[PDB]
Every structure is written in structure tokens, then in C-alpha cells.
Write a protein that binds this ligand. Structure first.
Ligand code: HEM
Ligand SMILES: *[C@@H]1O[C@H](CO)[C@@H](O[C@@H]2O[C@H](CO)[C@@H](O)[C@H](O)[C@H]2NC(C)=O)[C@H](O)[C@H]1NC(C)=O
Ligand SMILES: O=C(NO)c1ccccc1
Ligand SMILES: [Ca+2]
Ligand SMILES: [Ca+2]
Length: 336
């Protein structure tokens, strides 16, 4: 086969350097293959790098962004000044050093680190990994990243211009199952968006549908909504997307099966990874990506709440039978 210097077998010669950056990222960036803040920050970075792509700007004669081109690292001096890119500098610098030291393009490195980071989180699918994106990039145009205070129409139009259907926008948001916020309400730093910030599961879709009952911090932050229990943060765009008629039925369908959720998320991420590129010009090195440990827990409505506490918003499909839990209402600790 093509046997890499380390004895691993792979598809193509070009995949062998990625076994060295795999070891470096797992030992150093991810602190011993952990699923903590570095993974959550890299997931926010892959979205902010790739979504700087706009066919509408190109059509009007303007540069519309190179997509998944690593421009957020090569042109960090301009892209990290954008409102949406706060809290990312330290992760960007860490990634810059790995890219330089290994001689790989910045666009490829961000896609690789997302696939490897997710493999550290129980329940994750194995994401596709393609190599060969040119290292040359121009700065992304401003105002192409969706914000938590935007209306559902605004988010759907931005995402549609980039190439995503309403269903794929709901599918991409499965990444909020491994998420917290740091900059919307700094008083409750790293408050999780679902009760399992370290497990890639369906809890995010279930819990954003529950009635907002609780104010988790001393005041409300930017685009903050009432949440279902102490310690969980709910942002306005997630609350609105769960309830809007254009996205509500896809959101409800994501609540009962981790297997369907993983499959849909893997497909939407593969599409996002080549925005600005032709995937037929890239080399497939997906065999370098290791498997995640499986998640054996079933979907649940936490802490004694029942289906009467969820605000069913898909008028055509009845809400799935999800297991209920006993005990009092949970209070979530900060995400690690
Ligand atoms: C409709 C578009 C989306 C909006 C409006 C949005 C907005 C946000 C906001 C405001 C935060 C909190 C940032 C902070 O204050 O620390 C957040 C966190 C996060 N988002 Fe999104 N997001 C969206 C889509 C996505 C997508 C598509 C992905 C990736 C596939 C993603 C991955 C993450 C992750 C993993 C975090 C957690 C970061 C951490 O814990 O440090 N988001 N998002
Ligand atoms: C990809 O392009 C960037 C430049 O945009 C290169 O990054 C520079 O690399 C040099 C030498 O390795 C460093 O001293 C600079 O500080 C880097 N600049 C930035 C903005 O990071 C990078 O080397 C290129 N990588 C490859 C494989 O060609
Ligand atoms: O992460 C964001 N969008 O993905 C974001 C965060 C803060 C403000 C605006 C946008
Ligand atoms: Ca980019
Ligand atoms: Ca989760």
C-alpha cells in the first residue's frame, strides 16, 4: 500500500504528513485527546472560516470570499476585528504555529482539526477529510457571519446565499450540542447550550424546545432568552429557529435519534468544508481520522419535565415519545 513512515496504511502519499499533525494536535492542542474548550472553539472557527463566501457579492462584481480557505488565520488581523469573531485569538495563534511547523495549508488544517477534535467527543460521527486546498487567500468580506440577534429570515437568507437549504441550517446547528457561550453573558462564563456539552447527542434540540422558565445569571446578556433550568444558556436565534414554521419540523425530527442526527450533520459539514473549492480537485484522506467512543445514552427530557413542558411547533408531525427522567430540575456546571 502506501505505507507511511510510521507503518500506518493509507490511500495516498499526500495523507502521510497528516499522521504527524494528528499526534501534535492530540498531545498539545487537545491536551491529551480531550473534548473541552479547544474542540468547541475550533468548531466555531471552521464555521467562521467557511461561511466567508458569498455568490451574491461575486455576482455584483465584488470579491465574495474564498470560503474554507483558512483566511481567518492568514488574515486574522482583519477577520478577528469582526463582531462575530471574539474569543478566538488564542485558538487561532495555536493553530497558526501547528500549520507553519508542519507545512500544511491553513484551510486544510482547520478542517483536519475539526475532524480530529470531534473524534474526542463521545457520540461524534467520523467526518470526511480532504486535503489540497491552496494556502493562498484574501481576507473575508465583513458581515457574512450570522449573529444570535438576527431574525430567522436574515439567517436563512445568508446561509442560503452560501448554499444551504433551511434543513441544512438546522443540521449544521447540531454543533451546539458541544457548546457554551463566553462572550454573550460573561457573568455565567461557559454556561452550556445543552445538558451534555461533552457528548454529541440530541439533547440540544430537545432542550431548546422546552418552555423558557429560568434566568440563569444576574441579568440577561446580548441576545439571551429564558432557559429551562439553572446553568443552561439559551440564545435567541436557537430559540427562534426551533419554533419558526420554516425550520420547526426539521428541528423536531432531530430530537429522537442520535444516529439520524449524526448522519445529517456529517453530510452538511462535508458540504461546508469545500465552500470555495471543487472537491474533485482535492485528495481524500478520511482514513486518517480515528473513531469516537460510542454514546450509549438514550435521548431524555431532563429533570421531571414532560412533553407538556415542550412547546411543540411542527403542526404536521406529532412529538416523538422521548423518555422522561425523575429527580429535581438540574443545575448545570460550566462546560470544561
Ligand atoms: C445560525 C448560525 C449560528 C449562530 C447565530 C451562532 C451563534 C453562536 C454564538 C453567539 C455562540 C457563543 C459564542 C460565545 O459567546 O462564546 C456560539 C457558540 C458556538 N457555536 Fe454557534 N452559531 C451558529 C452556528 C454554528 C455552526 C454552524 C457551528 C459549527 C458547525 C457552530 C458552532 C458553535 C460552537 C461549538 C459553539 C461553542 C463555543 C464555545 O463553547 O466556546 N455554531 N454560536
Ligand atoms: C501559508 O501562508 C502563510 C502566509 O499567509 C504562511 O505563514 C507565514 O509563514 C512564515 C514562515 O513559515 C511565518 O514566519 C509567518 O509569520 C507566517 N505568516 C502568517 C500570517 O501566519 C505559511 O507559511 C504558508 N504555509 C505554507 C505551507 O505555504
Ligand atoms: O459566533 C457567532 N456567530 O456564529 C457570533 C457570536 C457573537 C456575535 C455575533 C455572531
Ligand atoms: Ca475563509
Ligand atoms: Ca450535547
Amino acid at each position: 500500500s502506501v505505507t507511511c513512515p510510521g507503518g500506518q496504511s493509507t490511500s495516498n502519499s499526500q495523507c502521510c504528513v497528516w499522521f504527524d499533525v494528528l499526534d501534535d494536535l492530540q498531545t498539545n492542542f487537545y491536551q491529551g485527546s480531550k473534548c473541552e474548550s479547544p474542540v468547541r472553539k475550533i468548531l466555531r472557527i471552521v464555521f467562521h472560516d467557511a461561511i466567508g463566501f458569498s455568490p451574491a457579492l461575486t455576482a455584483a462584481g465584488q470579491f465574495g470570499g474564498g470560503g474554507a480557505d483558512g483566511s481567518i488565520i492568514a488574515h486574522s488581523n482583519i477577520e478577528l476585528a469582526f463582531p462575530a469573531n471574539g474569543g478566538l485569538t488564542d485558538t487561532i495563534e495555536a493553530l497558526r504555529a501547528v500549520g507553519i511547523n508542519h507545512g500544511v495549508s491553513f484551510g486544510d488544517l482547520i478542517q483536519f482539526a475539526t475532524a480530529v477534535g470531534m473524534s474526542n467527543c463521545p457520540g461524534s460521527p467520523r467526518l470526511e477529510f480532504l486535503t489540497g486546498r491552496s494556502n493562498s487567500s484574501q481576507p473575508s468580506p465583513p458581515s457574512l457571519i450570522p449573529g444570535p440577534g438576527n431574525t430567522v429570515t436574515a439567517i436563512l437568507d445568508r446561509m442560503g446565499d452560501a448554499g444551504f437549504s433551511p434543513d441544512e441550517v438546522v443540521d449544521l446547528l447540531a454543533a451546539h450540542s458541544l457548546a457554551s457561550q463566553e462572550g454573550l453573558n460573561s457573568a455565567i462564563f461557559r454556561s452550556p447550550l445543552d445538558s451534555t456539552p461533552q457528548v454529541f447527542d440530541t439533547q440540544f434540540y430537545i432542550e431548546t424546545l422546552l418552555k423558557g422558565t429560568t434566568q440563569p445569571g444576574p441579568s440577561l446578556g446580548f441576545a439571551e432568552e429564558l432557559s429551562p433550568f439553572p446553568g443552561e444558556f439559551r440564545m435567541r436565534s436557537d430559540a427562534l429557529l426551533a419554533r419558526d414554521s420554516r425550520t420547526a419540523c426539521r428541528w423536531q425530527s432531530m430530537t429522537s435519534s442520535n444516529e439520524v442526527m449524526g448522519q445529517r450533520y456529517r453530510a452538511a459539514m462535508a458540504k461546508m468544508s469545500v465552500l470555495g473549492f471543487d472537491r474533485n480537485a482535492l485528495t481524500d484522506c478520511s482514513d486518517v481520522i480515528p473513531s469516537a467512543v460510542s454514546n450509549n445514552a438514550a435521548p431524555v427530557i431532563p429533570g421531571g419535565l414532560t412533553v407538556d413542558d415542550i412547546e411543540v411547533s411542527c403542526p404536521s408531525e406529532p412529538f416523538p415519545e422521548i423518555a422522561t427522567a425523575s429527580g429535581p430540575l438540574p443545575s448545570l456546571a460550566p462546560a470544561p
